[PDB]
C-alpha cells in the first residue's frame, strides 16, 4: 500500500499541468514530467518486486527476520536511490523539473516544490531503514554533492525568476 500510494500521485499532477496551465509550452512539459517521473517509478517498482518476491510478505516487521545477500542489497539500494532521485531531483535528472516549473501554473509549482518532491524522501527513508546494506555510500554522496554544486553554479546566468527558484 505504501508503494501504491506513492504511485497514485502522478495522474492528478499531470492533469493539473495539462488542463490548468495557461502557457502553450506546458503541453510538452507535462510529457517530460510524466516520462522522467515514470522512469523513476519503474526503477522503484523493480526494487519493490524484488523485495516482495524474495520475501513473501508485505510488512516492514517481517524484514527483521530475513537477510538479504550482498548482491541483492546492492541491487536494491541502487534501484531505490536512482528511482527516488528521479523525483527528488538528483544531478543528472532535473531537466523535467526545470521545464515543469517554467511552464506550470504558479499554484501547482508551489505544490510541486513544497510537498510533492518530499514524497520521494519519505519512501526512500523507509526502504533505506528496513534493509541491511553493506556498501559504501560514497557514490551516492558524490552524486548528491554534484547535484548541489551543479545547481548552485547555474544561478548567476538565470534571468527568469521562476527558473532561479527552481534551481534553488
Amino acid at each position: 500500500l505504501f508503494f501504491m500510494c506513492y504511485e497514485l500521485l502522478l495522474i492528478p499532477s499531470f492533469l493539473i499541468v495539462y488542463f490548468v496551465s495557461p502557457s502553450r509550452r506546458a503541453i510538452q512539459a507535462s510529457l517530460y514530467f510524466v516520462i522522467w517521473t515514470q522512469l523513476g517509478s519503474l526503477l522503484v517498482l523493480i526494487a519493490i518486486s524484488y523485495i516482495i518476491s524474495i520475501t513473501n510478505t508485505y510488512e516492514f516487521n517481517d524484514l527483521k527476520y530475513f537477510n538479504f545477500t550482498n548482491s541483492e542489497s546492492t541491487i536494491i539500494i541502487f534501484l531505490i536511490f536512482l528511482g527516488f532521485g528521479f523525483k527528488a531531483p538528483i544531478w543528472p535528472f532535473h531537466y523535467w523539473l526545470t521545464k515543469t516549473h517554467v511552464e506550470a501554473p504558479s499554484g501547482f509549482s508551489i505544490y510541486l516544490s513544497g510537498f510533492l518532491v518530499k514524497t520521494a524522501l519519505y519512501g526512500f527513508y523507509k526502504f533505506n531503514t528496513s534493509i541491511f546494506i553493506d556498501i559504501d555510500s560514497s557514490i551516492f554522496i558524490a552524486i548528491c554533492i554534484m547535484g548541489v554544486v551543479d545547481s548552485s553554479l547555474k544561478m548567476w546566468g538565470q534571468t527568469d525568476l521562476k527558473k532561479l527558484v527552481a534551481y534553488g
Partner: protein
C-alpha cells in the same frame, strides 16, 4: 568558451568521488564515521508507534 575550464567542469564528479575516497581512507584508520548505511536500530523507525491489538 574555455576548453580547460569545460574539461574541469566535466570531470567534477570524479574529483568529488576521489576526494571522498581519500577522506574515507582517513576515517578508516582513525576509526571515524565511515560512509556507510548504518544499521543500528534494526529497522525500528525514528519515533514510531509499536503497539498490538487484541
Amino acid at each position: 568558451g574555455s576548453l580547460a575550464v569545460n574539461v574541469l567542469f566535466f570531470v567534477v564528479p570524479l574529483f568529488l568521488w576521489l576526494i571522498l575516497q581519500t577522506q574515507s581512507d582517513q576515517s578508516s584508520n582513525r576509526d571515524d564515521n565511515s560512509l556507510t548505511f548504518y544499521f543500528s536500530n534494526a529497522g525500528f523507525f525514528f519515533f514510531q508507534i509499536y503497539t498490538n491489538t487484541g
